[PDB]
């Protein structure tokens with residue numbers, strides 16, 4: 001129940017404002033900046049502000065804060081969802097999200113803001129559907145918005161029918177300083193770029209553990225996805241009935257399903273790091289990286305970030321494989337490895353100086369995070385079984401998909 | 416299939432060597448298609464096994480079945496899920512339609528000795544589907 | 553070619569489940 | 571890469587080296603530094619802070635950083651331990667009561683893992699009174715032979731006369747430079 005959706009800037013100036021109900025004065029935005037400054041300086045800053053009887057709930061963008069004022073007991077989750085949809089629409093329409101496009105795309109920005117939400121209740125949020133009625137370079141609105149299918153425009157024709165899938169894995173490991181992993185969860189991400197003719201009804205089929213158990217084949221390798229979040233095109237009733245994933249793919253790239261299940265296996269990359277930091281004399285980084293993944297998979301662009309001292313200077317890196325560089329901007333040693341074959345072992349021996357004068361305040365111990373990304377390797381073992389592409393006209397589709405394994409929240413707690 | 420013919424003798428020898436009663440990860444061949452075994456493909460595989468021998472009358476074992484499924488997946492790209500048998504006790508029919516292979520007693524269904532027996536009626540009659548309509552959807 | 557694993561063709565449905 | 575310029579510079583002398591001047595107060599450290607730099611016995615007030623000078627001998631710039639022996643300046647010797655290659659210890663053989671304090675200070679300064687490549691340089695200062703010990707009694711009392719991985723050398727230098735300074739400089743050059 002947002003009262004006025006406005007876009008701020010880094011200097012407190014409102015780049016664009018669009019009131020939806022008018023129950024909140026437009027002058028309340030001026031007090032948002034002092035309130036945010038006071039909250040930040042006292043540690044009480046939150047995404048949802050409160051200027052007396054009006055709450056300023058907004059998120060932080062790349063360069064401006066999309067603060068949406070409200071007065072009644074409006075849904076905070078609804079406001080956040082509307083802000084996220086607006087950000088996604090802006091990203092789809094404008095390749096950059098900064099002040100350069102706010103002051104240059106006002107003619108289309110105002111129209112998009114007016115069409116997106118009326119009276120604080122959003123009605124249209126599909127970028128592809130919205131691009132057929134509001135353009136910066138007007139006909140009647142498309143029937144897709146009025147029709148039930150609001151995520152697949154009818155009449156789309158292509159020379160070929162090729163759909164590219166992307167099974168992107170997110171290996172997140174929360175390893176404590178004691179050497180044990182606390183939070184080790186893998187979140188799947190099935191992002192497909194559907195490019196077909198017409199409005200095909202894709203029938204996604206995978207080797208799900210529940211599906212295998214229901215069919216009676218609960219004995220082979222099946223992915224045990226604890227949480228499965230289907231897209232808007234995916235029919236919730238069909239999935240709830242008999243695990244049938246049937247939905248109409250959209251035109252372009254979109255996220256169909258987002259699996260998320262816990263992982264009880266050993267980490268793909270094991271980092272054994274030591275800190276022989278002398279008392280204001282020197283420091284040693286005996287960091288060893290052990291690859292527990294399969295030898296047939298190579299972790300391309302492996303970047304194990306080792307947090308070095310903030311005031312360390314004149315550092316020396318004695319590694320074996322991969323270039324090691326220290327970035328003073330990040331205050332850490334980036335153990336960058338181009339190709340990391342499975343089962344390999346890279347040993348590094350850091351050595352950096354330290355000023356004689358001790359630091360005035362503590363700096364903390366940021367966790368060490370690795371940036372391993374091994375393509376063609378599915379840690380969860382989930383494999384796509386079938387993709388039922390059915391069209392009324394009748395055509396031979398050529399679906400495609402690739403499996404990519406990377407590191408998500410794979411941080412290692414320091415000592 | 417020259418590759419299938421070559422792999423049939425080695426697969427049969429490995430199955431015979433394994434008695435009737437280390438590397439982590441799931442590597443995938445780049446560009447290799449993966450899909451469930453079809454009824455026609457299952458029928459062709461059953462016919463080839465019957466003609467070449469080594470599968471009809473062999474003692475059914477978990478290790479031998481797993482090795483055969485892995486070899487079939489490696490040589491054809493078929494998932495190792497269509498080589499399933501109906502629950503016992505007694506004669507177990509193939510879960511996938513078109514398969515000509517079935518398990519029959521040779522003497523709890525787990526301790527019962529079973530052997531692979533060719534059955535041409537499996538490719539035409541859905542014995543497994545009729546026995547377990549719920550499992551077939 | 554493509555970084556992150558070469559794209560592989562997908563099947564149409566579970567042919568082994570009818 | 572090419573090292574022709576380095577070879578040309580080394581053909582006529584390129585190495586400079588460094589040195590440190592630490593010890594108890596009134597131990598002849600300032601007078602020794604003045605004699606090494608100028609060559610005269612200059613009377614100066616106690617070193618509240620520190621004195622930095624350089625000595626050019628044998629084509630090597632022997633920079634000397636005098637450090638006082640004051641109580642408030644005793645723990646300040648760690649400031650010069652950074653980017654330091656040499657260290658010279660000035661003993662006070664004329665102060666029997668301060669000999670133990672000087673030995674304790676030398677042991678404390680020698681018990682740091684940052685100062686490991688600095689070879690020991692014991693200078694017998696105030697070598698003009700009959701109460702001064704020899705070059706072995708002072709070393710035996712200080713236990714210089716028990717300093718593992720430490721190259722120490724005891725030399726007797728007279729502040730008023732200046733004898734033995736050349737021998738100490740030659741020993742320091744031989745310990746620092748390992749060429750012809």
Ligand SMILES: Nc1nc2c(ncn2[C@@H]2O[C@H](COP(=O)(O)OP(=O)(O)OP(=O)(O)O)[C@@H](O)[C@H]2O)c(=O)[nH]1
Nearest residue numbers: 595596597598599600601614616617638696729730
């Ligand atoms: N007359 C005489 N006095 C000496 C001799 N050797 C050392 N001293 C004493 O040592 C002191 C040397 O002090 P400085 O030259 O100013 O420098 P320092 O040795 O670091 O002493 P502080 O400045 O107090 O730390 C003099 O005041 C002398 O009293 C010597 O050979 N003859």
Ligand SMILES: [Mg+2]
Nearest residue numbers: 599600617636
């Ligand atoms: Mg002095």
